[PDB]
C-alpha cells in the first residue's frame, strides 16, 4: 500500500544523505492519505533524520 511504500522511500531518503524534500502531488484523490502520512512522519522526530 501507500503507507509502506512511503516508509521505503523515507528509508531511501535516510540513505544517500537526503534531508530536504518537497512534495509535488496531483489532484488525484488517492494521495491525501499520502500527504497526511508524510506530514505525520515529519512530525515524528524522536528518531530518524
Amino acid at each position: 500500500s501507500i503507507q509502506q511504500q512511503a516508509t521505503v522511500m523515507l528509508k531511501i531518503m535516510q540513505d544517500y544523505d537526503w534531508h530536504v524534500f518537497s512534495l509535488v502531488t496531483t489532484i488525484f484523490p488517492g494521495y491525501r492519505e499520502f500527504i497526511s502520512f508524510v506530514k505525520t512522519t515529519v512530525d515524528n522526530s524522536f528518531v530518524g533524520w
Partner: protein, 50 residues
C-alpha cells in the same frame, strides 16, 4: 499507589498558587520516577514522552 507525605519548596509554591488562583492540589508522584524526555523504545514509529 499508597499515599505518601511529600513537602518542600515546590509544595509551598503550589499552595501559594492555589491560594492566589482558587486551585485544588492533587499531588501525585510520577510512576516512572524520572523527569522524562524523548527516547526510543520497541516499535520505534511514534514520537512519545515518558
Amino acid at each position: 499507589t499508597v499515599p505518601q507525605c511529600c513537602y518542600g519548596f515546590c509544595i509551598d509554591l503550589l499552595i501559594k498558587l492555589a491560594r492566589t488562583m482558587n486551585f485544588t492540589y492533587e499531588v501525585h508522584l510520577v510512576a516512572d520516577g524520572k523527569f522524562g524526555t524523548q527516547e526510543r523504545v520497541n516499535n520505534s514509529n511514534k514520537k512519545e514522552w515518558n
